[PDB]
Design an enzyme around this catalytic site. Structure first.
Site, short mmCIF file in Angstrom:
data_model
loop_
_atom_site.label_atom_id
_atom_site.label_comp_id
_atom_site.label_asym_id
_atom_site.label_seq_id
_atom_site.Cartn_x
_atom_site.Cartn_y
_atom_site.Cartn_z
N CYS A 107 0.87 -1.17 0.00
CA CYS A 107 0.00 0.00 0.00
C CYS A 107 0.91 1.22 0.00
O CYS A 107 1.40 1.64 1.05
CB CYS A 107 -0.94 0.00 1.20
SG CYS A 107 -0.40 -1.10 2.49
N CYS A 110 -0.48 4.24 2.16
CA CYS A 110 -0.52 4.12 3.61
C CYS A 110 -0.11 2.73 4.09
O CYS A 110 0.98 2.24 3.76
CB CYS A 110 -1.91 4.51 4.14
SG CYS A 110 -3.23 3.46 3.54
N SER A 111 -0.98 2.09 4.88
CA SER A 111 -0.54 0.90 5.60
C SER A 111 -1.54 -0.25 5.55
O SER A 111 -1.39 -1.22 6.31
CB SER A 111 -0.20 1.24 7.06
OG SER A 111 -1.18 2.03 7.69
N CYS A 112 -2.51 -0.23 4.62
CA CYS A 112 -3.63 -1.16 4.67
C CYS A 112 -3.20 -2.61 4.41
O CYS A 112 -2.49 -2.91 3.45
CB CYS A 112 -4.74 -0.73 3.71
SG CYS A 112 -4.27 -0.62 1.99
#
Lengths: 203, 228
Positions: A107, A110-112
């Site tokens: 991702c 971000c961090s998904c």
């Protein structure tokens, strides 16, 4: 990396600790946060939800061709067959590694990460170093960082997960495991192999 | 927006730091920061898209080098101030108090069981973002499409490295909450969602692996047809 402007880790941790405790006290006084709420979230993601759930899905797919078909057609519904699902994995799509295709998930924005099957992501997955490079030089990254050599003739598909659709890698079953039990096979499945940064464990 | 969090294709950020095994939570404050997410969500601080937009407005050097859960603290405070639910002056006073008295107790409070029931329901039931819409999808597998060159200042999921690029639709997933509205306080405004495949040569030029592609999720307004 050296940044001459940066405080020591100890000083950073001390300041963060004070700011977090202050915010915590205010949310507690608002009646919207409690210490028991905090403890429940920690207990779930330390002990109840983690990559052993994803490993169960992988080994069932390796040992049940009909389940594997359902898993690739509708990952959320297939995982629900085993009681696996929920927060940050409401929509899962599993992708199958083969002799000609290798999948890796990131991702960049971000961090998904698919929490119901892998737990919370390791820190390197959320950090800018992996995220920036894996979409640009995935073959070089896998070799240099993970010791994983993907031959240049083999296609690498990088899934940049920009939405709520969670992509999970179904790694190939390692050779030399014919007739192994589901428990023995699960010892070869790692979170790294379900991200695609490593294959399932050899031997 | 076009912030430093949009790192795809950026160079020079350094080697991956992968400490051989690590705990889920590296310090007690991380557990608190993590669990504040459902608490502030239930209380109306923000939705998931607004949460991300808050992180995107951090100081960029702080974002690049601070602990991950510190990003979450910053977004809670951002939305706490936005909604009027957090008084900054009282927050700064309490911070100094806990600086000087780090072992001082937290305020007395009831362990309301509904808040824990909320945690269990959220964790195992989920918060699905899928939504029904009347219109059918505009695009289908195999369509060749081009990604918008728009550069909004507000929240979006339009990584710089895919803007203006041409790819092939690989899957239609149904309709989902649209980040460009939801993250900017404009509501869910659900749009159909697709995965689109871009070749490495399309994205990076001749430095591109001839045997690699990037699969990127595109909501319907992000893409326009090139060849059906």
């Amino acid at each position: 990396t050296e940044n001459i402007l940066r405080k020591s880790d100890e000083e950073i941790q001390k300041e963060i600790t004070a700011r977090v405790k202050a915010l915590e006290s205010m949310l507690i006084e608002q009646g919207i946060l409690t210490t028991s709420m905090i403890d429940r979230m920690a207990e779930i993601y330390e002990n109840e939800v983690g990559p052993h759930l994803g490993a169960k899905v992988v080994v069932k797919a390796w040992t049940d061709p009909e389940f594997k078909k359902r898993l690739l057609a509708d990952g959320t519904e297939a995982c629900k067959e085993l009681g696996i699902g929920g927060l940050q994995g409401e929509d899962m799509m599993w992708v199958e590694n083969t002799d000609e295709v290798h999948h890796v998930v990131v991702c960049t924005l971000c961090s998904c990460y698919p929490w119901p099957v892998l737990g919370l992501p390791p820190n390197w997955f959320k950090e800018p170093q992996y995220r920036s490079r894996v979409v640009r030089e995935p073959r070089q990254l896998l070799k240099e960082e993970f010791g994983f050599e993907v031959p240049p003739s083999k296609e690498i598909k990088v899934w940049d997960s920009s939405s709520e659709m969670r992509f999970v890698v179904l790694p190939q079953r390692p050779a030399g495991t014919d007739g192994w039990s589901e428990e023995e096979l699960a010892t070869l499945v790692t979170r790294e192999s379900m991200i695609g940064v490593e294959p399932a464990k050899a031997v | 927006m076009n912030g430093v969090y949009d790192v795809g294709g950026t160079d020079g950020l350094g080697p991956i730091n992968r400490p051989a095994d690590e705990p889920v939570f590296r310090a007690e404050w991380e557990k608190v920061a993590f669990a504040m997410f459902p608490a502030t969500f239930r209380a109306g601080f923000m939705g998931l898209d607004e949460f991300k937009f808050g992180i995107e407005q951090m100081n960029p050097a702080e974002y690049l080098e601070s602990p991950y859960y510190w990003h979450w603290i910053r977004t809670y405070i951002h939305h706490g101030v936005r909604t009027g639910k957090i008084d900054l002056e009282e927050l700064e006073r309490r911070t100094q108090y806990y600086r000087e008295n780090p072992d001082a107790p937290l305020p007395e409070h009831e362990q309301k069981p509904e808040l824990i029931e909320f945690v269990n329901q959220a964790v195992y039931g989920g918060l699905p973002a899928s939504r029904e819409v009347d219109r059918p999808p505009k695009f289908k597998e195999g369509d060749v499409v081009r990604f918008s060159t728009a550069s909004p200042k507000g929240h979006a999921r339009r990584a710089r490295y895919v803007r203006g690029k041409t790819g092939t639709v690989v899957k239609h997933h149904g309709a989902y909450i649209y980040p460009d509205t939801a993250g900017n306080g404009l509501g869910e405004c659900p749009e159909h969602l697709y995965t689109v495949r871009f070749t490495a040569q399309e994205l990076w030029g001749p430095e591109g692996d001839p045997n690699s592609s990037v699969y990127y999720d595109c909501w319907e307004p992000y893409i326009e047809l090139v060849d059906t």
